[PDB]
Write a protein that binds this ligand. Structure first.
Ligand code: NA
Length: 129
């Protein structure tokens, strides 16, 4: 599923991400924009660790989900990487909560590069929340 921005905003808020461990909704919307363009089926190969980033949060297979093919890997979220690409982002959100709790918001390099020290208020512009 590719989300519209405000549709995603509403979904992330319903799933308890607004302010979760100090990360505002608009920050999550900026992160997911730059990571995946709001596409739940986004994938990107990471040759540095021969791994793949999956779904709207671009969660990596070396650490956080099982995909079988990744060498020297663990499954921190106890989930198949496929489940992090479901149209229903519930499992993806649960795993993001785990990641941010364990490693902090800086776990997402895309957030550091595009969102940190930027005004991200525009991500909720025109959304009913
Ligand atoms: Na894994």
């Amino acid at each position: 599923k590719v989300f519209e921005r405000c549709e995603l905003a509403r979904t992330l808020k319903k799933l308890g991400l607004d302010g979760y461990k100090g990360v505002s909704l608009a920050n999550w919307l900026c992160l997911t924009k730059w990571e995946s363009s709001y596409n739940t089926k986004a994938t990107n190969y990471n040759p540095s660790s021969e791994s793949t980033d999956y779904g709207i949060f671009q969660i990596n297979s070396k650490w956080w989900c099982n995909d079988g093919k990744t060498p020297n890997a663990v499954d921190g979220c106890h989930v198949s990487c496929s489940e992090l690409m479901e149209n229903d982002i519930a499992k993806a959100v649960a795993c993001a909560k785990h990641i941010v709790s364990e490693q902090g918001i800086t776990a997402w390099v895309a957030w550091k590069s595009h969102c940190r020290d930027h005004d991200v208020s525009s991500y909720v512009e025109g959304c009913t929340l």
